[PDB]
C-alpha cells in the first residue's frame, strides 16, 4: 500500500501533477534568485566604509553622488523585484489550481470506486464484518485523503525547491561551509519521516475509532423506535462516548507527535544556524574564506531552513492522507467469490421451471461449526408450486436464499435444467427470479419509484396491474399522492400489511420465471390474505413458484408441498397424501428552514463551549505570541550579530567570542522548541476535548427528538449520521492548530510593526496602507466559500442518505440487482460538490497568487521608498533593509492568515446548525423529569375518543374515532384490515405522538401528566417486525430493562417463557452468540421470541403485543400463547393480531375499520352477530 494513493490518476492528473510540481519549483527558486542578483556584495556600506572613511566621506558632493548611485542601483532592484512578483502570480496559481484540480479529480474517483466495491462484495462478506462503520469510510475517511494529495504537496514542493536552491547558491560561491550545513539535512529528514510513520499510523488508529463511533450511531438511529420504547438512550450515549474517548486519547497523540515533529525541525534549524557561525569563524580564522564569502554563503542558506519549518505541516497532512488510505484500499482491492459484475456466465436464451437441489449440505459463514443443511434433496418440476413448512428455524428462507446464490452450498449442487447455478452468470440468475423476502423491506422514495426497483422499464399500466395482483390498488389510490406518497425509510410509514403488498407488486412486476415467496401473507388479514392468494393462482402455470408459510391456509393448495426436519425434507407430496402420512404437516395442520443564513458569533458560541480549558488556551498564546514575535525579533538579533562578525577586531581571540554567541542561537533554538511544542500541544487538546464534547451533545439531542422528527424525510437515518459526523469534522478544521497560527500570525505582525517604527520611519505607512488589500481578498475568497458551505452540506447529506440507504439493505438490493442503480444514483449525488471543489480550487489559486505577488510587489515599494527617503536622508541603509526584513514577515503572516478564511467560513455555520440541534426541544421531552410518578397504578388503560392523524400525511386521519377501555388482568385483540390503525393506537399508549382530539387515560388519569420515562417504563412492548441489536442474544434480553442490572437467571426465565431457550442452549457460545444487524443473523421466528423475551425479562404492568407471533410456527404459537395465558392472571394485555387462533382466548376482541371501533365484544358476542369478525374467522371454512 506504498505510493498507491495515486492509482485512479489519469493522463490529465499526470500532466496536473507534473505541471504544478514545476511550478511549485519555479515559485520556490524565486527566494533564492532574489538573494543571487544581490549576491554581488561588494558594494556593502559606502556608509560602513564612511565609520572608517568620515574623513574621506566628509565631502558632502562626494557622499551625495554614492547616496544617488545608490537610489540608481536600488531601483535596479524594485524594477527586477516587480516582475519577479509578477512570474508568482502565474506559477503560483499554476500549481495550487493544479494539485486541487488533480485531487479533486482523483478523490471524485476514489469515492465511486469505493462505493462501487461495497456493492460489490458478497452476502458473506456483509455478514461478517460490521458494515455500519462503511458510512464513515465513505465521509470522514476519503476526506483524510482529500486534505493530503491536494495543494499541500504543491506547497511541500515549493518549500523544498526554496531550500535546495538556496543550497546550490551557497554551493557554488562558499563550498565547504555549504557542506558543513548540508550534513544536518539528513537528521531533518529522518526527524520528519519518522514522525510521520508514527501520524500515519496514529491517524489508522483514530480513524478506526470514528468508524466504530459512526456504527454505533447509525445503530441506534436505525432503530431509534426501539430505542425510545425501551428508554436506552443513555446506554446508547455510553457507548457512542467510549468510542469518542478512544478517538480522542488517539487524536491526542497525534498532535504531540505532530507538533514536537514541529519544534524538532525549527531547534534543528537553529542548530545549523549555530554550526555556520562557528565553522565561518573557524574558516575567517584559517584565512581559507573571505570573510565577504562566508556572508554570501550565510545570505544564501539560510532562509530555506524556515522554508522546512514551515512545510512540516504539509508533511504531517501527507501523513494523514496515507494512514487514512489504508482501509479504503483494502476494501477496494477485495474481490469477491460470486461476482455479480462478472459477464463470464452462461446466460440461456429459454429457461423453464426445473430446480434441483441434490445432498445440499450449508452452514452459514458467521456460524461456521452449526450445521444448517445436511443432505437436502428437492426436486421441483415446471408450473409447479412447492411449498416449504416446518419448526421456525429449520432452514426454508436458508434454501431460497441458496436458489438466489446468495451463498455457495457446501456440498452438493442447486442447478436448474440440470446446469448447475454456478456456471450461469450471477446477474442473469437473480435477473430471472422474483424474490419476497420474509419481513419485506422497502426504500425512502416513492410507491411507484419501489416498484418501479423491480424492474426498470416498467410502465404505469404494468405498475398498475401488478398493484391490482398484490390486492393493493385500493389503499394506493385511497392516499393522496397515489403512487407519488413518500415512504419512510424501511418502509416504516406504511403498515405492515400494505408494505408486504407493495413488496408483493414490486417482486410481481419483473414477470419472473421462478417466484420465490417468504411467508408473503405475514402481515395481511385473512381477507386480504385470500385475494392475494387467489391473484397469484390465476398466474401459476407460466412461472414455477417456492414458497414459504406458517398459515398453512396459502399452503393447502399447493401442487407439493414439502417439510423441514432437521435440516432435510423428510414428508414431500400433495395435501391428500402429507394428510395420510400422518407426519409433521399433518401435525402442523392439526395443531390448535434556512433560519436567517449563519448567525455571527455561532463559532464563537462553541469556543465558548469550550470555557473549561481556559489554562490551555491561555497558556498556547502566550507560547504562540512568544515564538511569533521571535522571528523578527531574531532577525534583528541576526543583523546585529552579523554586524559584530563582520567588523570584529584584529584578534582572533573576540572571533571565538562571536562563537560564543553562536550559544545563544542554541538557546533560541532550545526556546523555540519548547513555545511550539507548547502553542500546539495546548491547542490541539483543546481543540480534541471540543470536538469529543461536541459529538457528545450532538448525539445527545439528537436521542432527545421525538419520533415525528425521524420521520422527517430530512432526518433519516443516512442524514443524521452524515450529519453528526460533518457538523464536528468541520469546526475541527478551524479550532485546532489553525487558530493557534492565527495568533501567532497577528504577533507576527504586531513585532513587525514595533520594530519598523523604532528602527526606521515612514516605511510603517506602506506596511499599514497593504494590509486592506489582503483583507479584500479575504473577503472576496469568504463570500464564495461561505455559499458553497451551505450547499455542499446539504447535498452531502443526500449522499449519505444513499450510501447508508444502500449499505443497510444491501441484501434487498442484491436480491432486485440495483447495485448499478444506487451506484449512479451515487454519482449523481456527489456531482455537485465536485463543481464546488473544481471552483474552490481555482479561486484558492487566484487568491495564493494574488497574495505572494502582492507581497512581493510590497518588497518592491519598499525599496522604491527607501531609495527615494535616502534621498531625502532621513534614515541610513541599515534600517531601510531591517525593517524589509520587519515587513516581509509580518506581511507574510497576514497573507498566511488569509488562507484560512474558507475554514472559518465552514466552521461558522456548521457551528449555527450544532448550536440549532442542542438547543432544539422536543414537546414530548423525553429526558424530563418534571411530571407525574404515581408510586402504584391500577392498570387501566383507556382510548377515550382519540382522534390522531400522523405528522407527515396530516390530511388523511388515521384514527378517526375509537374509544377503548381496558381493565387489570384483562386482554384485548385487536382486530381488523390492514391499515386500520391497529399499531398506531399502540404507538400512542407508547407517547410516540400526540393525539389532537380526544385523551388517553392510565388509571383515569390524562397521559400527558405523568413523566413519559416512567409511563414508558410501566409498560412492555411487542413490535410487529422487530429489530435486534448487533450485540449477544443475552444482552438484547437484558435490554428489556434498562434501569437495573438484569440477572442471567432471570434473562433464562424469559427465554424458557418464549420457547426459545432451546434454540439459545443448543449454540455455541450460548446467550453470548452475536446476532447481526437487526437480527437478520436469526430467522424471523427466533429474532420474534427473543424480542418476546426482552419485553418478557422486565415483567411489564401493561403489555402490547403487536401481530407477537406473525412469523411463528403453529407448535410455536401454541406454546407461546399457552406460556401467555399462564400469566395472564394480574397483567395488563393488548393483543394485535391477523392470526384469530391467539385471540379467541382473549377476554374482549375489537373489531376497527378504517380507523373506527365498530365492533367490540367476547368471543361469543362477535361470533353470533355474525358480520366482520364471522367473515375474517371463516375465510377458510
Ligand atoms: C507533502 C509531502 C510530504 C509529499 C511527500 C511525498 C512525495 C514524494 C509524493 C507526493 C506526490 C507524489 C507524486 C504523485 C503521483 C505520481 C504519479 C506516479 O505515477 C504512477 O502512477 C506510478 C508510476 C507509474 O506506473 O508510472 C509517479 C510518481 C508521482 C509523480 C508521485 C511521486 C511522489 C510524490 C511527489
Ligand atoms: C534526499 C533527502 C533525504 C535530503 C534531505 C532533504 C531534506 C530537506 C528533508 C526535509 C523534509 C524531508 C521529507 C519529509 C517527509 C518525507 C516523507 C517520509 O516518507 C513518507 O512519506 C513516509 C510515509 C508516511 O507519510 O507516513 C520520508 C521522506 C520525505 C519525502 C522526506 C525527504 C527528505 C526531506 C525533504
Ligand atoms: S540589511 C538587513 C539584513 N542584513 C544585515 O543585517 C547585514 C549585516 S552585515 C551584512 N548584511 C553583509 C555586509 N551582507 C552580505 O554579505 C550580503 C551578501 S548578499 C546579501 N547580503 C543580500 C543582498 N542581502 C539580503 O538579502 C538581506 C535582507 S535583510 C538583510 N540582508
Ligand atoms: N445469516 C445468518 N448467519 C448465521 N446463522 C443464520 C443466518 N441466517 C439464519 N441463521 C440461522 O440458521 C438457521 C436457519 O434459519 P432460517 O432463516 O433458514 O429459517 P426459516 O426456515 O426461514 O424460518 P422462519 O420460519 O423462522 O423464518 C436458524 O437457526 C438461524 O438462526
Ligand atoms: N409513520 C407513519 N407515517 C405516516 N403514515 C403512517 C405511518 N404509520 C402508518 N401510517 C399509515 O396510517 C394508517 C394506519 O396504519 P397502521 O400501521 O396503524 O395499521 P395496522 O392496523 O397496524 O396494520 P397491519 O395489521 O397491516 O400491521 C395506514 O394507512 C398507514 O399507511
Ligand atoms: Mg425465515
Ligand atoms: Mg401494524
Keep these: 500500500s506504498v505510493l498507491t494513493m495515486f492509482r485512479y490518476a489519469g493522463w490529465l492528473d499526470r500532466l496536473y501533477m507534473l505541471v504544478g510540481t514545476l511550478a511549485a519549483i519555479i515559485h520556490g527558486v524565486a527566494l533564492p534568485l532574489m538573494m543571487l542578483i544581490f549576491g554581488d556584495m561588494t558594494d556593502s556600506f559606502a556608509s560602513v566604509g564612511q565609520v572608517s572613511k568620515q574623513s574621506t566621506q566628509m565631502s558632502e558632493a562626494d557622499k551625495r553622488a554614492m547616496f544617488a548611485k545608490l537610489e540608481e542601483e536600488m531601483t535596479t532592484y524594485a524594477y527586477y523585484y516587480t516582475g519577479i512578483g509578477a512570474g508568482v502570480l502565474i506559477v503560483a496559481y499554476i500549481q495550487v489550481s493544479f494539485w486541487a484540480l488533480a485531487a479533486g479529480r482523483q478523490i471524485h474517483k476514489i469515492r465511486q470506486k469505493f462505493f462501487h466495491a461495497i456493492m460489490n462484495q458478497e452476502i458473506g462478506w456483509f455478514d461478517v464484518h460490521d458494515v455500519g462503520e462503511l458510512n464513515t469510510r465513505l465521509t470522514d475517511d476519503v476526506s483524510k485523503i482529500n486534505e493530503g494529495i491536494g495543494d499541500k504537496i504543491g506547497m511541500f514542493f515549493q518549500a523544498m525547491a526554496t531550500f535546495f536552491g538556496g543550497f546550490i547558491i551557497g554551493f557554488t560561491r562558499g563550498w565547504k561551509l555549504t557542506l558543513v550545513i548540508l550534513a544536518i539535512s539528513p537528521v531533518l529528514g529522518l526527524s520528519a519521516g519518522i514522525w510521520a510513520k508514527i501520524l500515519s499510523s496514529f491517524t489508522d488508529k483514530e480513524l478506526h475509532a470514528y468508524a466504530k463511533a459512526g456504527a454505533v450511531a447509525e445503530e441506534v438511529l436505525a432503530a431509534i423506535r426501539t430505542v425510545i420504547a425501551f428508554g436506552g438512550q443513555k446506554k446508547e450515549l455510553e457507548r457512542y462516548n467510549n468510542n469518542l474517548e478512544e478517538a480522542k486519547r488517539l487524536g491526542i497523540k497525534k498532535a504531540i507527535t505532530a507538533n514536537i515533529s514541529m519544534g524538532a525541525a525549527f531547534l534543528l534549524i537553529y542548530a545549523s544556524y549555530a554550526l555556520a557561525f562557528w565553522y565561518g569563524t573557524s574558516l575567517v580564522i584559517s584565512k581559507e574564506y573571505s570573510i565577504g564569502q562566508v556572508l554570501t554563503v550565510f545570505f544564501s542558506v539560510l532562509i530555506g531552513a524556515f522554508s522546512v519549518g514551515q512545510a512540516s505541516p504539509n508533511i504531517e497532512a501527507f501523513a494523514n492522507a496515507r494512514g487514512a488510505a489504508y482501509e479504503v484500499f483494502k476494501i477496494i482491492d477485495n474481490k469477491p467469490s460470486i461476482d455479480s459484475f462478472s459477464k463470464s456466465g452462461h446466460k440461456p436464451d429459454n429457461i423453464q421451471g426445473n430446480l434441483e437441489f441434490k445432498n445440499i449440505h450449508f452452514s452459514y459463514p458467521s456460524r461456521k461449526e452449526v450445521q444448517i443443511l445436511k443432505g437436502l434433496n428437492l426436486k421441483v418440476k415446471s408450473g409447479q408450486t412447492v411449498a416449504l413448512v416446518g419448526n421456525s428455524g429449520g432452514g426454508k428462507s436458508?434454501?431460497?436464499?441458496?436458489?438466489?446464490?446468495?451463498?455457495?452450498?457446501?456440498?452438493?449442487?442447486?442447478?436448474?435444467?440440470?446446469?448447475?447455478?454456478?456456471?450461469?452468470?450471477?446477474?442473469?440468475?437473480?435477473?430471472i427470479i422474483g424474490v419476497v423476502s420474509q419481513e419485506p423491506v422497502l426504500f425512502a422514495t416513492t410507491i411507484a419509484e419501489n416498484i418501479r426497483y423491480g424492474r426498470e422499464d416498467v410502465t404505469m399500466d404494468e405498475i398498475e396491474k401488478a398493484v391490482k395482483e398484490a390486492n393493493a390498488y385500493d389503499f394506493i389510490m385511497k392516499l393522496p399522492h397515489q403512487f407519488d406518497t413518500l415512504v419512510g425509510e424501511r418502509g416504516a410509514q406504511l403498515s405492515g400489511g400494505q408494505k408486504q403488498r407493495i413488496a408483493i407488486a414490486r417482486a410481481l412486476v419483473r414477470?419472473?420465471?421462478?417466484?420465490?415467496?417468504?411467508?408473503?401473507?405475514?402481515?395481511?388479514?385473512?381477507?386480504?390474505?385470500?385475494?392475494?392468494?387467489?391473484?397469484?393462482?390465476?398466474?401459476?402455470?407460466?412461472?414455477?413458484?417456492?414458497?414459504?408459510?406458517?398459515?398453512?391456509?396459502?399452503?393447502?393448495?399447493?401442487?407439493?408441498?414439502?417439510?423441514?426436519?432437521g435440516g432435510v425434507i423428510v414428508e414431500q407430496?400433495?395435501?391428500?397424501?402429507?394428510?395420510?402420512?400422518?407426519?409433521?404437516?399433518?401435525?402442523?395442520?392439526?395443531?390448535?428552514?434556512?433560519?436567517?443564513?449563519?448567525?455571527?458569533?455561532?463559532?464563537?458560541r462553541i469556543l465558548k463551549l469550550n470555557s473549561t480549558e481556559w489554562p490551555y488556551f491561555?497558556?498556547?498564546?502566550?507560547?504562540?505570541?512568544?515564538?511569533?514575535?521571535?522571528?523578527?525579533?531574531?532577525?534583528?538579533?541576526?543583523?546585529?550579530?552579523?554586524?559584530?562578525?563582520?567588523?570584529?577586531?584584529?584578534?582572533?581571540?573576540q572571533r571565538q567570542n562571536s562563537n560564543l554567541f553562536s550559544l545563544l542561537f542554541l538557546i533560541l533554538g532550545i526556546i523555540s522548541f519548547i513555545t511550539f511544542f507548547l502553542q500546539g500541544f495546548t491547542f490541539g487538546k483543546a481543540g480534541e476535548i471540543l470536538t469529543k464534547r461536541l459529538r457528545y451533545m450532538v448525539?445527545?439531542?439528537?436521542?432527545?427528538?421525538?419520533?415525528?422528527?425521524?420521520?422527517?424525510?430530512?432526518?433519516?437515518?443516512?442524514?443524521?449520521?452524515?450529519?453528526?459526523?460533518?457538523?464536528?469534522?468541520?469546526?475541527?478544521?478551524?479550532?485546532?492548530s489553525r487558530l493557534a497560527v492565527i495568533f501567532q500570525n497577528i504577533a507576527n505582525l504586531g513585532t513587525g510593526i514595533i520594530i519598523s517604527l523604532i528602527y526606521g520611519w515612514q516605511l510603517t505607512l506602506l506596511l499599514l496602507a497593504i494590509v486592506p488589500i489582503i483583507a479584500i481578498a479575504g473577503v472576496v475568497e469568504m463570500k464564495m466559500l461561505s455559499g458553497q458551505a451551505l450547499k455542499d452540506k446539504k447535498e452531502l447529506e443526500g449522499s449519505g442518505k444513499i450510501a447508508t440507504e444502500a449499505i443497510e439493505n444491501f441484501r434487498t438490493v442484491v436480491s432486485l440487482t440495483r447495485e448499478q442503480k444506487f451506484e449512479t444514483m451515487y454519482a449523481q449525488s456527489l456531482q455537485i460538490p465536485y463543481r464546488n471543489a473544481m471552483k474552490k480550487a481555482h479561486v484558492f489559486g487566484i487568491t495564493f497568487s494574488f497574495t505572494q505577488a502582492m507581497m512581493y510587489f510590497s518588497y518592491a515599494a519598499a525599496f522604491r521608498f527607501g531609495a527615494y527617503l535616502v534621498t531625502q536622508q532621513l534614515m541610513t541603509f541599515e534600517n531601510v533593509c531591517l525593517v524589509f526584513s520587519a515587513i516581509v514577515f509580518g506581511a507574510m503572516a497576514?497573507?498566511?492568515?488569509?488562507?484560512?478564511?474558507?475554514?472559518?467560513?465552514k466552521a461558522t455555520v456548521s457551528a449555527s446548525h450544532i448550536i440549532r440541534i442542542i438547543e432544539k426541544t422536543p414537546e414530548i421531552d423525553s429526558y424530563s423529569t418534571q411530571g407525574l410518578k404515581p408510586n402504584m397504578l391500577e392498570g387501566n388503560v383507556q382510548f377515550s375518543g382519540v382522534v390522531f392523524n400522523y405528522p407527515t400525511r396530516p390530511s388523511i386521519p388515521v384514527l378517526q374515532g375509537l374509544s377503548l377501555e381496558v381493565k387489570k388482568g384483562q386482554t384485548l385483540a385487536?382486530?381488523?384490515?390492514?391499515?386500520?390503525?391497529?399499531?398506531?393506537?399502540?404507538?400512542?399508549?407508547?407517547?410516540?405522538?400526540?393525539?389532537?382530539a380526544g385523551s388517553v387515560f392510565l388509571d383515569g388519569k390524562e397521559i400527558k401528566q405523568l413523566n413519559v420515562q416512567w409511563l414508558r417504563a410501566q409498560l412492555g412492548i411487542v413490535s410487529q417486525e422487530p429489530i435486534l441489536f448487533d450485540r449477544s442474544i443475552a444482552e438484547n434480553i437484558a435490554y428489556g430493562d434498562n434501569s437495573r442490572v438484569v440477572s442471567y437467571e432471570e434473562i433464562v426465565r424469559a427465554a424458557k417463557e418464549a420457547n426459545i431457550h432451546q434454540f439459545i442452549d443448543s449454540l455455541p457460545d450460548?446467550?453470548?452468540?452475536?446476532?447481526?444487524d437487526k437480527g437478520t443473523q436469526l430467522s424471523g421466528g427466533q429474532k420474534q421470541r427473543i424480542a418476546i423475551a426482552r419485553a418478557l425479562v422486565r415483567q411489564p404492568h401493561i403489555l402490547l403485543l403487536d401481530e407477537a407471533t406473525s412469523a411463528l410456527d403453529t407448535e410455536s404459537e401454541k406454546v407461546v400463547q399457552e406460556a401467555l395465558d399462564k400469566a395472564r392472571e394480574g397483567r395488563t394485555v393488548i393483543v394485535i393480531a391477523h392470526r384469530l387462533s391467539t385471540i379467541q382466548n382473549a377476554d374482549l376482541i375489537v373489531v376497527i375499520q378504517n380507523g373506527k371501533v365498530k365492533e367490540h365484544g367476547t368471543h361469543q358476542q362477535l361470533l353470533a352477530q355474525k358480520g366482520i369478525y364471522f367473515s375474517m374467522v371463516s375465510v377458510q371454512a
Design 398 to 431: 436458508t434454501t431460497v436464499q441458496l436458489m438466489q446464490r446468495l451463498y455457495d452450498p457446501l456440498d452438493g449442487m442447486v442447478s436448474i435444467d440440470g446446469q448447475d447455478i454456478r456456471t450461469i452468470n450471477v446477474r442473469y440468475l437473480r435477473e
Design 511 to 565: 414477470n419472473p420465471k421462478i417466484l420465490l415467496l417468504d411467508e408473503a401473507t405475514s402481515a395481511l388479514d385473512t381477507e386480504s390474505e385470500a385475494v392475494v392468494q387467489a391473484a397469484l393462482d390465476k398466474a401459476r402455470e407460466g412461472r414455477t413458484t417456492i414458497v414459504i408459510a406458517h398459515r398453512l391456509s396459502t399452503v393447502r393448495n399447493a401442487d407439493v408441498i414439502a417439510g423441514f426436519d
Design 573 to 604: 407430496g400433495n395435501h391428500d397424501e402429507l394428510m395420510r402420512e400422518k407426519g409433521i404437516y399433518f401435525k402442523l395442520v392439526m395443531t390448535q428552514a434556512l433560519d436567517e443564513d449563519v448567525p455571527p458569533a455561532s463559532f464563537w
Design 618 to 653: 491561555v497558556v498556547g498564546i502566550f507560547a504562540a505570541i512568544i515564538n511569533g514575535g521571535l522571528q523578527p525579533a531574531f532577525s534583528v538579533i541576526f543583523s546585529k550579530v552579523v554586524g559584530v562578525f563582520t567588523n570584529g577586531g584584529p584578534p582572533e581571540t
Design 699 to 736: 448525539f445527545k439531542s439528537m436521542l432527545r427528538q421525538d419520533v415525528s422528527w425521524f420521520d422527517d424525510p430530512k432526518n433519516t437515518t443516512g442524514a443524521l449520521t452524515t450529519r453528526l459526523a460533518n457538523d464536528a469534522a468541520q469546526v475541527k478544521g478551524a479550532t485546532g
Design 894 to 905: 497576514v497573507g498566511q492568515v488569509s488562507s484560512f478564511a474558507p475554514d472559518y467560513a
Design 974 to 996: 385487536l382486530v381488523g384490515s390492514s391499515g386500520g390503525g391497529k399499531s398506531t393506537v399502540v404507538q400512542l399508549l407508547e407517547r410516540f405522538y400526540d393525539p389532537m
Design 1070 to 1076: 450460548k446467550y453470548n452468540t452475536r446476532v447481526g
